[PDB]
Design a protein around this motif. Structure first.
Motif, PDB file in Angstrom:
ATOM      1  N   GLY A 180      33.051 102.988 -97.066  1.00 61.71           N
ATOM      2  CA  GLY A 180      33.827 101.995 -96.437  1.00 61.71           C
ATOM      3  C   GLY A 180      33.295 100.736 -97.035  1.00 61.71           C
ATOM      4  N   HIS A 181      33.973  99.806 -96.390  1.00 63.50           N
ATOM      5  CA  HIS A 181      33.608  98.226 -96.891  1.00 63.50           C
ATOM      6  C   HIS A 181      34.381  97.400 -95.922  1.00 63.50           C
ATOM      7  N   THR A 241      36.913  94.628 -94.847  1.00 57.95           N
ATOM      8  CA  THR A 241      38.331  94.299 -95.361  1.00 57.95           C
ATOM      9  C   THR A 241      38.651  92.971 -94.276  1.00 57.95           C
ATOM     10  N   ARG A 261      41.811  91.733 -92.706  1.00 56.38           N
ATOM     11  CA  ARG A 261      43.152  92.542 -92.349  1.00 56.38           C
ATOM     12  C   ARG A 261      43.632  92.063 -91.231  1.00 56.38           C
ATOM     13  N   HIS A 298      35.549  96.584 -90.596  1.00 55.95           N
ATOM     14  CA  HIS A 298      35.173  97.844 -91.504  1.00 55.95           C
ATOM     15  C   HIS A 298      36.501  98.543 -91.765  1.00 55.95           C
ATOM     16  N   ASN A 299      36.868  98.744 -92.980  1.00 56.32           N
ATOM     17  CA  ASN A 299      38.112  99.377 -93.602  1.00 56.32           C
ATOM     18  C   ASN A 299      38.168 100.789 -92.710  1.00 56.32           C
ATOM     19  N   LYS A 300      37.209 101.611 -92.306  1.00 56.27           N
ATOM     20  CA  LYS A 300      37.565 102.986 -91.818  1.00 56.27           C
ATOM     21  C   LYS A 300      37.665 102.885 -90.358  1.00 56.27           C
ATOM     22  N   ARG A 355      42.566 100.426 -86.702  1.00 54.72           N
ATOM     23  CA  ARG A 355      43.328  99.101 -87.005  1.00 54.72           C
ATOM     24  C   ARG A 355      43.216  98.180 -85.936  1.00 54.72           C
ATOM     25  N   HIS A 393      37.265  92.735 -98.817  1.00 62.00           N
ATOM     26  CA  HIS A 393      38.287  92.964 -99.399  1.00 62.00           C
ATOM     27  C   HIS A 393      39.490  92.457 -98.622  1.00 62.00           C
ATOM     28  N   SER A 436      43.684  92.782 -97.431  1.00 58.76           N
ATOM     29  CA  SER A 436      44.836  93.579 -97.374  1.00 58.76           C
ATOM     30  C   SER A 436      46.130  92.830 -97.928  1.00 58.76           C
TER      31      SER A 436
END
Ligand SMILES: Nc1nc2c(ncn2[C@@H]2O[C@H](COP(=O)(O)OP(=O)(O)OP(=O)(O)O)[C@@H](O)[C@H]2O)c(=O)[nH]1
Ligand SMILES: [Mg+2]
Ligand SMILES: [Mg+2]
Ligand SMILES: [Mg+2]
Ligand SMILES: [Mg+2]
Ligand SMILES: [Mg+2]
Ligand SMILES: [Mg+2]
Ligand SMILES: [Mg+2]
Ligand SMILES: [Mg+2]
Ligand SMILES: [Mg+2]
Ligand SMILES: [Mg+2]
Lengths: 115, 212, 51, 416
Positions: free
Chosen positions: A6-7, A9, A11, A29-31, A34, A73, A75
């Motif tokens: 993971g990393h 993000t 979003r 965390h991307n994982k 939502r 990152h 989105s």
RNA sequence: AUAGGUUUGGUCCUAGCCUUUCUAUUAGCUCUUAGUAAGAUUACACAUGCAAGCAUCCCCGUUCCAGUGAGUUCACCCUCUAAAUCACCAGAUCAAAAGGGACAAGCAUCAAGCACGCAGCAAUGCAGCUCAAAACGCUUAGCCUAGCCACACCCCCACGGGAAACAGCAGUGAUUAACCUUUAGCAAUAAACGAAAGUUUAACUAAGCUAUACUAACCCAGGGUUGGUCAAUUUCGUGCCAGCCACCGCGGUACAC
């Protein structure tokens, strides 16, 4: 929950009620889910026009920059929001969709003229 | 606080490690293709639609190198996709080869070479990626000079780009706040950034391998 | 397709430049807060006041 | 306020459209009704009223209702006669007209359904179709042979002889009857059987009579309602529609409707619930009147005053029809004086912990007809001293019940 | 608590019990509409359908999301430092294993645990360590809720075995007082994949059912109660019977049935 890989993000997490969308720009965390645990709430976004015909977006630019530096990152919706804001360049897909819309409306106008 | 030790966890973990190590599938099995159904029998997973034509009509790197002394060591090997997608010479030097000896025809393996992408040679030799891919072609000894004779293009690239509107405004405002009244336009250097084409080979050393 | 490829190339170049700049700024901020003139001055002032 | 949902008034002549015929193959035990059905379908006691939509070589489609021949399933035979519109009685001339043959004849007379005689086992020796017709003369089935309207067809279901003639006669009688029904509008039908599948919940094999059934419809029948969830055929393949005179298994039943109950389509789930509540309230008023009379008797008695050899049985069946048949057999008990028979609880489905608990509480015996009892249930029954008796045949189960009655005492009750 | 009713022939004190308030589940009786929120009783067993692809082949993901609360001081702080992101590195972010500290409830009619310590490089030596300031032990409970911990059919684990797994969505049998659709689309956000257009997703979105709740409306109101505490009964019928009560109590010719 110990996540493998993971990393971070930046979003949009969808809050709000039914038929009434609202987004919290969260660096998470991307994982992670939502709408779940998030490292930091970097802004907010109300996609529904208000009484003044505006879609209020708030971008905590300082922390957004700090997280982009720290290696988060973005989105695609967040990238497009920043592109509209001018913090980023306009997204290639925003540009291409604008051109597609131009061509679509052109076809519609041409057919209306013909008929 | 001390928990009852989980001996079976460690036992099974080590046993599975050993079984994986000793039964790791061979390249001949991993990279076998059913040309009739376009599936890899080992996993039974179809290949992407766009690759069917290449799989049916093109040969693999070790497939070519099986018909060469020292397995073609010292030769230049190119790719169909590169030939189609570029005009500059694209090829590997193929310093070293290690075929898949169990293969019936020795058409699978692991190669090392020095890449010449768009006519720019790397300064060292590294492994060849996509060896198992079906788009490969051999550079003949003759015509090799014509193929690899390339005239470099001018390196005049934009050193700087305009800042995005809002960032430029913020930078200018911050500078004026600090006190400087210089009117020089803020710019964003892009020389430190080199945009490698999306088909530049990756590091097969770090690329993983399918398991059994 | 070609136009979009070029646009993405340029966009990713610019975004990588911006991300490099932000990474540099983050590193500089942490470097300063850790071992800058202000921080070391405060540490020395605290030590001298304590003595 | 009356919220009952009633059958729509008879269909308009213009709305009427041709529909398939519904044929019931009645007869006494082991007269080859099952063999005849198998031969017609192109594919040793019947215990379930089975509906099959067969397609004839002519291309016509006919719904056959194969009914049990045993004396016990009088309710099943009556329901089949009521639902069907033609009765293809099957009689073995060697055996002759029997008690259940006459019972089927009477049921046909009640239902007002044309009767077609099929002489089964006509290949065997001693077969006397003329004698069969003669005997039927007494029971009012005047065969066309003896100046009548009833068509008699000699056949040999085992050898498949003259079955083509039988099918031709059935088709001709159907055309003469001129059967038609409205294919549109709210659906109307009758439940032919109901059961509980561990996978599909409460299911009901019914025969549509009006309108067309489709997934998502709201049906009401008795005190039960359903949102049609899965409509399936005999072989289980889903069917998107069920026209009139089509046998369909309907899932999605909130409650298990009684066999033979009428199914009517209503507008919506809330309307269906209102109808069910109203029907339950009506039943409650009836039972309340009965209880009021009993209580008034008791209270008069109290005011004036103020001035063992018992077998408890739980019944678990595979289908509601089977449970009802066993209940009728039980009610035919008459030797209460020497030993009393008490029915603690009857139901449909495999032996359940509730059944075991009732058996333990009342020192009862569980009688499972075509039902299973998992190893967990068996272990619990052994632990609690309950006795489970799983029988696959009605008369075998009845014999076992008689043996238990005698053990409690042989029992004077003769099932007949 | 702003308190009230209740011990008695009567008063005062102590004291338990109950009433009044607010929620939630179930049940009876009843119910018009719209919006939103929430929604098996069960770690018991499951028919059926779907829920993980992407992509020029390799790789990457299917270890995530989603679910349940069986178990249960693995969650929080510090030290150190893996894996992952920052196109490569940079130190930055994130966060494992490890080490130190903190960390639920009742039972003491669970008071002894029985090696639970230290030193030495090692050999080995000393005989020590926890505990009435609750050790050890039994039972119960998911928690400290932007969410976290734990489990993933059972054998704590899962090589192996038992056996053939919905605690993913819809749904079902059993069970309980407890009971939502066997819907539609990836248009939005999130995730996977790709250089990308894009593809996939029972996550999610938009719908379906349910007075469980909130809001708003309604030009068709039911439920409960009427001796006192506690707002509020006319006439009959019964006559310590039928019956009623949260407490006190009523019913022997009744503002309590
Ligand atoms: N010889 C002969 N036997 C036949 C013929 N048709 C049927 N049978 C047999 O006669 C018997 C008929 O019994 P079934 O129809 O199977 O059963 P049933 O009539 O429901 O009787 P129960 O189920 O016991 O109540 C079976 O053994 C058939 O195979 C025929 O044409 N000829
Ligand atoms: Mg038969
Ligand atoms: Mg209620
Ligand atoms: Mg628990
Ligand atoms: Mg004791
Ligand atoms: Mg399970
Ligand atoms: Mg396990
Ligand atoms: Mg489920
Ligand atoms: Mg159920
Ligand atoms: Mg409920
Ligand atoms: Mg009176």
């Amino acid at each position: 929950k110990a996540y493998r890989g993971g990393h971070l993000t930046i979003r949009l997490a969808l809050g709000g009620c039914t038929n009434r969308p609202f987004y919290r720009i969260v660096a998470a965390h991307n994982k992670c889910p939502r709408d779940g645990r998030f490292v930091e709430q970097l802004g907010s976004y109300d996609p529904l026009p208000n009484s003044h015909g505006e879609k209020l977006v708030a971008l905590n630019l300082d922390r957004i920059r700090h997280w982009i530096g720290c290696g988060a990152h973005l989105s695609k919706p967040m990238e497009k929001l920043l592109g509209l804001a001018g913090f980023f360049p306009l997204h290639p897909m925003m540009i291409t969709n604008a051109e597609r819309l131009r061509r679509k409306r052109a076809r519609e106008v041409l057919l209306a003229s013909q008929k | 606080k001390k928990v009852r030790p989980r001996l079976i966890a460690e036992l099974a973990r080590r046993v599975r490690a050993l079984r994986e190590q000793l039964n790791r599938p061979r390249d001949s099995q991993l990279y076998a293709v059913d040309y009739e159904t376009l599936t890899r029998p080992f996993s039974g997973r179809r290949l992407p639609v766009r690759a069917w034509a290449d799989v049916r009509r093109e040969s693999r790197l070790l497939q070519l190198l099986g018909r060469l002394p020292l397995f073609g060591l010292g030769r230049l090997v190119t790719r169909k996709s590169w030939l189609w997608q570029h005009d500059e010479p694209c090829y590997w030097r193929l310093t070293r080869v290690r075929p898949d000896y169990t293969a019936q025809n020795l058409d699978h393996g692991k190669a090392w070479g020095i890449l010449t992408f768009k006519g720019k040679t790397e300064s060292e030799a590294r492994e060849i990626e996509h060896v198992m891919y079906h788009d490969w072609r051999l550079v003949p000894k003759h015509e090799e000079e014509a193929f690899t004779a390339f005239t470099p293009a001018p390196e005049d690239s934009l050193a700087s780009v305009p800042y995005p509107p809002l960032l430029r405004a913020m930078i200018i405002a911050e500078r004026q706040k600090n006190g400087d009244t210089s009117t020089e336009e803020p710019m964003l250097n892009v020389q430190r950034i080199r945009m490698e084409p999306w088909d530049y080979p990756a590091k097969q050393e770090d690329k993983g391998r399918a398991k059994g | 397709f070609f136009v979009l490829m070029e646009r993405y190339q340029h966009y990713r170049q610019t975004v990588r430049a911006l991300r490099m700049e932000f990474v540099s700024e983050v590193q500089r901020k942490v470097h300063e807060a850790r071992a800058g003139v202000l921080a070391e001055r405060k540490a020395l002032k605290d030590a001298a006041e304590h003595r | 306020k009356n919220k009952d949902a009633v059958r729509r008034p008879q269909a308009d002549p213009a709305l009427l459209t041709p529909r398939s015929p519904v044929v019931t193959i009645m007869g006494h035990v082991d007269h080859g009704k099952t063999t005849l059905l198998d031969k017609f379908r192109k594919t040793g006691i019947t215990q379930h009223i089975g509906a099959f939509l067969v397609s004839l070589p002519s291309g016509e489609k006919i719904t056959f209702l194969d009914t049990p021949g045993h004396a016990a399933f009088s309710a099943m035979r009556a329901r089949g006669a009521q639902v069907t519109d033609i009765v293809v009685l099957v009689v073995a001339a060697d055996d002759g007209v029997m008690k259940q043959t006459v019972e089927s004849i009477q049921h046909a007379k009640d239902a007002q359904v044309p009767i077609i005689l099929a002489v089964n086992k006509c290949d065997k020796a001693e077969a006397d179709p003329e004698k069969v017709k003669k005997e039927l003369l007494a029971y009012d089935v005047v065969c066309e042979d003896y100046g009548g309207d009833v068509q008699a067809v000699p056949v040999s279901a085992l050898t498949g002889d003259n079955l083509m003639a039988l099918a031709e006669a059935t088709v001709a009688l159907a055309e003469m009857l001129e059967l038609k029904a409205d294919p549109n509008g709210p659906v109307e039908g009758t439940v032919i059987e109901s059961f509980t599948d561990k996978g599909r919940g409460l299911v009901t094999t019914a025969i549509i009579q009006r309108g067309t059934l489709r997934k998502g419809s709201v049906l009401v029948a008795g005190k039960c309602w359903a949102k049609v969830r899965l409509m399936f055929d005999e072989n289980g393949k889903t069917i998107d529609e069920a026209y009139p005179s089509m046998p369909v298994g309907i899932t999605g039943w909130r409650d298990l409707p009684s066999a033979g109950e009428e199914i009517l389509e209503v507008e919506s789930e809330p309307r269906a619930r209102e109808v069910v509540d109203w029907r339950k309230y009506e039943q409650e008023q009836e039972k309340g009147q009965e209880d009021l009379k009993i209580i008034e008797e008791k209270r008069k008695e109290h005011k004036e005053a103020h001035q063992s050899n018992v077998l408890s049985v739980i019944i678990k069946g595979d289908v509601d029809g089977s449970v009802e048949a066993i209940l009728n057999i039980i009610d035919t008990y008459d030797a209460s004086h020497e030993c009393e028979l008490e029915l603690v609880h009857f139901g449909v489905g495999d032996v359940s912990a509730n059944d075991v608990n009732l058996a333990e509480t009342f020192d009862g015996v569980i009688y499972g007809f075509n039902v299973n009892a998992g190893n967990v249930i068996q272990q619990s029954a052994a632990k609690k001293g309950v006795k489970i008796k799983l029988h696959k045949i009605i008369y075998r189960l009845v014999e076992d019940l008689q043996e238990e009655l005698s053990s409690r005492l042989k029992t004077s009750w003769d099932p007949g």
